[PDB]
Structure formats: C-alpha cells, structure tokens
C-alpha cells in the first residue's frame, strides 16, 4: 500500500489515475464509492482496513513558455498552469 | 451645507441597509457558467 503519489488503482469499479490523500470524513458501512457536487467519483473506500481515501488527479493544465521578444534575449522560462512543484 | 451633508450620510446608510438584506447582474453570469460546466461532465455520461 502506497499513498500521496500519482498512482493507478482498480478498486472493482474504476481505473483512475491520481493520488490517495487521507480524508477526514467517515462513510457509512454499506457504500464503496463516493461522488461529489460535480458528479465525479473522487472517494473510494479501501477494502483492506476501511480507510477512506480521496482521489485527486496529477495532470492539471499544461505548460507555458515566456519569450521576452526578438532582438532582446535568447533564454526562456517554463511556466506551469496548475501543477505544484 | 449641513442639510445636504446630512442627506448624503442618510443616502449611504440607506444603500448599506438595502445591500445587507442577492444581486441579479452579478449572479446570472456565474449561474450560467456553473450550469455549463455541469453540463460538460454530464456529456461524458
């Protein structure tokens, strides 16, 4: 069992790629998955020891290049949109 | 000058008491974007 990395799991109902953060809400002992307001399955109960974990994707947005302009410089910079460093 | 200065302070207090009791032009631009984002996730279903 590994946590806090962008991993891939198959918990009997889906194959999603993301992280597994420790949640603070306990589920009822009859459910297995969990949706949200945006209609996305982002909470799957672990059947090992009944540990509720949240799902957050690891790919958010894209990259960006900053160019100062012609006849000014030669180097650039890499900018991430919604990717934490 | 003391009459218009008292009427100006009474006009500010009437706007502050009316706004504390939602707006329409600042809510339809958010509700239309919220329903459009909730429609795109429903398109995947």
């Amino acid at each position: 069992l590994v946590k806090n990395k962008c991993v891939n799991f198959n918990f009997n109902g889906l194959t999603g790629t993301g992280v597994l953060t420790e949640s603070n809400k306990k589920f009822l002992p009859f459910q297995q998955f969990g949706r949200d307001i945006a209609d996305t399955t982002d909470a799957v109960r672990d059947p090992q020891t009944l540990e509720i974990l949240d799902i957050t994707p690891c790919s958010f947005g894209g990259v960006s290049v900053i160019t100062p302009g012609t006849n000014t410089s030669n180097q650039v910079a890499v900018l991430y949109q919604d990717v934490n460093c | 000058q003391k009459l218009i200065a008292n009427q100006f302070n009474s006009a500010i207090g009437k706007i502050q008491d009316s706004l504390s009791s939602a707006l329409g032009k600042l809510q339809d631009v958010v509700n239309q974007n919220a329903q459009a984002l909730n429609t795109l996730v429903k398109q995947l279903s």
């Binding site: 945006a38 947005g61 | 939602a22 958010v30």
Partner: peptide, 24 residues
Amino acid sequence: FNKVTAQKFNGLTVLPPLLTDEMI
C-alpha cells in the same frame, strides 16, 4: 464580497486572471 457567491477533475481547469481582487 460575501453577498454574491471539483469542476477541474475532468480537465475543466479554471485559469486565474491577471489582476486579483486585491489589485482591483
């Protein structure tokens, strides 16, 4: 600000504007 009031899970990311609420 308190009077008027995830979606990014399906690739619908929200980009921040150039000027925040403090600069406005």
